[PDB]
Amino acid sequence: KEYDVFIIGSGMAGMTIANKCASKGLTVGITDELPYGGTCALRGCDPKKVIIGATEVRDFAKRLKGSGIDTIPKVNWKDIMAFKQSFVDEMPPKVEKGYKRNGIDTFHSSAKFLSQNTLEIGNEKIKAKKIVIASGSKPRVLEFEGGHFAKTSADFLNLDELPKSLLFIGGGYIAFEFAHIAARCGAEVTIVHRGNNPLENFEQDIVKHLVSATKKLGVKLILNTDVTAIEKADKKFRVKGKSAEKTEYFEAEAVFNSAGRPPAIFDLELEKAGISFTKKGVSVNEHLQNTSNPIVYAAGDAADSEGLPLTPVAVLEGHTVASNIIKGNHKKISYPPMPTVVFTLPTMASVGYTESRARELNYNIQVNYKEVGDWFNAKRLNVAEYAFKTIIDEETQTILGAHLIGPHTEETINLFAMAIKTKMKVNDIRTMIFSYPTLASDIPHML
Amino acid sequence: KEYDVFIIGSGMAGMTIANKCASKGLTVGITDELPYGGTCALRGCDPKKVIIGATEVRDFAKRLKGSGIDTIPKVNWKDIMAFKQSFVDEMPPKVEKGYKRNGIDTFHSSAKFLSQNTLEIGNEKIKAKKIVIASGSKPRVLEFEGGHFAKTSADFLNLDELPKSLLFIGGGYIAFEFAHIAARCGAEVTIVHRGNNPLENFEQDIVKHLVSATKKLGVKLILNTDVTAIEKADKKFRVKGKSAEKTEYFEAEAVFNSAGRPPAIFDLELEKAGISFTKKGVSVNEHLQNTSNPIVYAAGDAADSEGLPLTPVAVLEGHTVASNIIKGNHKKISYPPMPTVVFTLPTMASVGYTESRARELNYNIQVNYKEVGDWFNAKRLNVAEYAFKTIIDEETQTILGAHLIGPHTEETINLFAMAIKTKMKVNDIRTMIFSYPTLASDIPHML
Ligand SMILES: Cc1cc2nc3c(=O)[nH]c(=O)nc-3n(C[C@H](O)[C@H](O)[C@H](O)COP(=O)(O)OP(=O)(O)OC[C@H]3O[C@@H](n4cnc5c(N)ncnc54)[C@H](O)[C@@H]3O)c2cc1C
Ligand SMILES: Cc1cc2nc3c(=O)[nH]c(=O)nc-3n(C[C@H](O)[C@H](O)[C@H](O)COP(=O)(O)OP(=O)(O)OC[C@H]3O[C@@H](n4cnc5c(N)ncnc54)[C@H](O)[C@@H]3O)c2cc1C
Ligand SMILES: NC(=O)C1=CN([C@@H]2O[C@H](COP(=O)(O)OP(=O)(O)OC[C@H]3O[C@@H](n4cnc5c(N)ncnc54)[C@H](OP(=O)(O)O)[C@@H]3O)[C@@H](O)[C@H]2O)C=CC1
Ligand SMILES: NC(=O)C1=CN([C@@H]2O[C@H](COP(=O)(O)OP(=O)(O)OC[C@H]3O[C@@H](n4cnc5c(N)ncnc54)[C@H](OP(=O)(O)O)[C@@H]3O)[C@@H](O)[C@H]2O)C=CC1
């Protein structure tokens, strides 16, 4: 079998490129070793956010207790899992039906290269004129003793019962979001992180408020401790934590792998196709084309790209690859502001540069950082943690970055994104009119 | 007593101008016939939004019932009133303390003009070089029989107990927002509106979904019926409704005046100062200066201005008046997009032009209207009503307006505001990156 385009993975990147390429009369083939839809839809952003919803109900009631609410609901684990599970189950049929409907050849096996332009799909041989690697990323294989007793983000999202005690290895997005969920549903939770700081790429002047919020929730955070072993006891697990000071041991029903997500490229036999790759994924140029094999493109978490491993980024990288495969190399990938969020309660969000990174680019900057728990918006919702840090280019009076924790920040952060992209002057923002009363109306006050 | 500036009203407009003028070394005087802070802070946006908060808790629980929540909280009227009351009581001391601190002379009586440049404050005579009318607006005096049994928006916001049955006269913002509150707290509610359409200045293709949402909530909406009398029965009120077809009578514990808000200018003896006014408020030029008396300025709901009677508008009108009083007439008032919201659940929001108004300006337009109750964002929150209408200038591929109902619309509408003001191209918006999963991420899909 010979195609114009063969795609590895039908997550956000792979789908985006299948549908677009098919639409311009190319012959399209695509395999996923798992149900079609990718990580976000099946085992990431979407199943998570559904579940977070039921926690939002408890937290909001807990917050106005005695101020007009007299009962704080317990979350019904089964019911919300079941509700989550419905969005999950309905996704693959939808996608497949879209493929058969667009004239896209569909496969359901793991893929290895046999040569430059040729693929072993399950127990078949397949060839193409252009190949795309959109296989995303996968839980880190924990190399040390007991490593394999680490359950995944995906396992977490599938649990029939919430354990009595959880422990997350690695203090990033997942550990914190899943700790909030787990804690709000009535489980003890521990996060063990080898760094001196959690959530290391966020503005620590902001992070500390979430760390505060997290601990008030009863969650244990251990810093400066590397996890080096797991041992299964009677209906328990026992975890080794190594610091400079000591080795300590932690007991919990259930241990989870939060330790970051390497690209899903290491079982692909890329060497057999003369395809250049680092440990951050497939190596790409301005056209998202591989640097040795000129017939290969990549997009999403699998791509060693200047873009953040996020759902909207996999799509934008999709469109450049799709377009360059279709018309030849003509379009260079261009990244706008890449807003990011930690779906804790309260949510934290960031866009553009941190202080530290703004200084590294030798910008003369203004910083505005303030803790504003006393502002009407935080006060009326009884959310204790509300703080912001903005970074203004002093010379052009345009925004370079903004980092927020508090109510609706996952929404509000997009206005800062729009602001950065449109190169809006700080004064045009100050004299602009918002709906009130809203969180958006606090922006003029952050400068 | 002789001042550089005397201000009538310390709501948003009056405050804004006091503080700014004082700050540039002018002598400032200011009276409010009520506690300092204005309608928004004391008897409008702020006390309302606090209360709406406790309803958000019930509605969100009601929405995920059986999907992970097993109890729908009753709202504790006293407790939330008491909570509301705290924000209300803390406002005037804050403002006064700001005045004494800025060197602002403070008065607490109703104001009438005695002449061109002269004011009767309580039982005093006062003169100024520039005078500002920032007296906002006031419930309509209901002229007909029983008119005076109509309780106010303000009375509503102050109730010790929620009645068993409410009836609102006039189907605008207040009737709908207060009906939602009242209904969610367990009272029967009726809205009586003389028009064929409710919420007449909104896009009716959107309004109808809120009308749908409102009726599913058990609220009675009567159209094409003018209210012509009220009669107090035994622990009851009985209301006359006149249509073409008939006269019908409605019984309720409590009747409220939702019938629109004339400017608070008609008891000011403006004639005695040769001050030009229509029934929409004090007549103003580009400088927000009166058109006969050249020493007078106005700002906010009291001003017959091209701006919407809203908290953020009173502020922007403040700054032009303040600035022109300070440096002389030099600055013309300029209005950006004026986002507006109906704090029902679900919220509805609008910005820029309706279809009908876009056509009136002879724009070649594209319209995108869709009901999207099936979108992930509505589905995961179980909000039945999610719909949008956008209006694109066909020629410049920039937005002219957008009208939304659904989750976080009061927030999302500001992105459309930013979009209109920054004259962002529809494609730059489509290829821009949002945080996901968020309501903001549905914008590219509305075009
Ligand atoms: C728990 C979790 C939460 C997240 N939350 C968010 C969030 O809130 N917001 C956000 O923006 N991003 C979030 N992300 C990141 C987001 O999921 C990714 O950035 C996005 O899925 C990238 O799309 P992709 O197409 O590159 O990869 P994917 O969507 O994962 O698609 C790749 C596909 O390749 C398949 N595949 C892998 N290896 C092979 C192989 N050898 N053979 C065949 N098929 C293969 C996979 O099964 C998968 O279906 C989250 C990730 C996780 C794990
Ligand atoms: C129930 C309600 C809800 C609202 N919700 C919103 C909302 O959610 N968002 C929004 O943007 N807008 C909202 N508004 C409108 C908003 O309140 C006004 O646009 C805003 O208050 C205008 O400010 P202003 O300074 O012109 O008037 P005000 O803020 O009312 O200030 C005028 C002041 O003048 C005083 N005064 C009046 N007459 C006299 C007199 N003769 N002598 C002395 N003092 C006098 C008044 O007591 C008052 O303190 C709402 C209004 C109401 C009634
Ligand atoms: N809202 C969103 O946008 C979300 C996005 N995601 C996506 O998922 C991925 C995030 O993965 P996540 O699991 O949070 O990991 P992160 O990379 O965010 O952080 C994990 C941390 O774990 C530490 N760690 C590694 N090994 C150990 C160990 N043995 N003991 C203790 N700590 C250890 C690492 O330290 P070190 O760095 O020093 O090696 C690292 O800092 C990204 O692709 C992200 O885009 C995840 C959820 C939410
Ligand atoms: N979220 C926000 O921004 C909010 C803003 N506000 C502010 O408050 C004001 C809105 O006042 P509101 O009370 O909602 O009034 P609106 O002007 O919005 O609408 C009231 C309606 O009542 C009708 N009406 C008048 N008399 C009768 C009668 N006898 N019987 C039946 N219907 C009648 C009127 O019909 P007709 O027009 O045909 O004469 C009118 O359409 C504005 O200043 C607004 O800015 C209010 C609350 C929320």
Residue numbers in the entry:
A (entry chain A), B (entry chain A): 2 to 448
Copy text verbatim from the article accompanying this structure deposition.
In this study, we identified and characterized mercuric reductase (GbsMerA), which is coded as a component of the mercury resistance (mer) operon in G. salicanalis isolated from Antarctic soil. We characterized GbsMerA, a mercury reductase belonging to the mercury-resistant operon of Gelidibacter salicanalis PAMC21136, and found its maximum activity of 474.7 µmol/min/mg in reducing Hg+2. As seen in the structures of thioredoxin reductase (high Mr), trypanothione reductase, glutathione reductase, glutathione amide reductase, and dihydrolipoamide dehydrogenase, the overall structure of GbsMerA also comprises an FAD-binding domain (residues 1–146), an NADPH-binding domain (residues 147–275), an interface domain (residues 276–340), and a dimerization domain (residues 341–447)29. GbsMerA has two pathways that connect molecular surfaces to the si- and re-faces of the isoalloxazine ring in FAD.
Furthermore, we determined the GbsMerA–NADPH complex structure. Residues at the NADPH-binding site are conserved, similar to those found in other MerAs, and generate positively charged surfaces. These residues included Arg141, His194, Arg195, and the nitrogen atoms of glycines (G171, and G173). Structural comparison between the FAD- and FAD–NADPH-bound forms indicated that these residues were not changed upon NADPH binding, except for Tyr174 and Arg195. Arg195, which is located at the edge of the central sheet of the NAPDH domain, was tilted toward the solvent area in the NADPH complex. Another residual change observed upon NADPH binding was Tyr174. However, in the NADPH complex, the side chain of Tyr174 was flipped opposite to the isoalloxazine ring of FAD by 6.5 Å (OH group). The Tyr174 residue was replaced with the nicotinamide ring of NADPH. Therefore, the isoalloxazine ring of FAD, nicotinamide ring of NAPDH, and Tyr174 are aligned and stacked with cation–π interaction. Mutation of Tyr174 to Phe showed decreased activity by 50%, indicating that the interaction of Tyr174 with the isoalloxazine ring of FAD through the hydroxyl group of tyrosine may be important for controlling the NADPH binding.
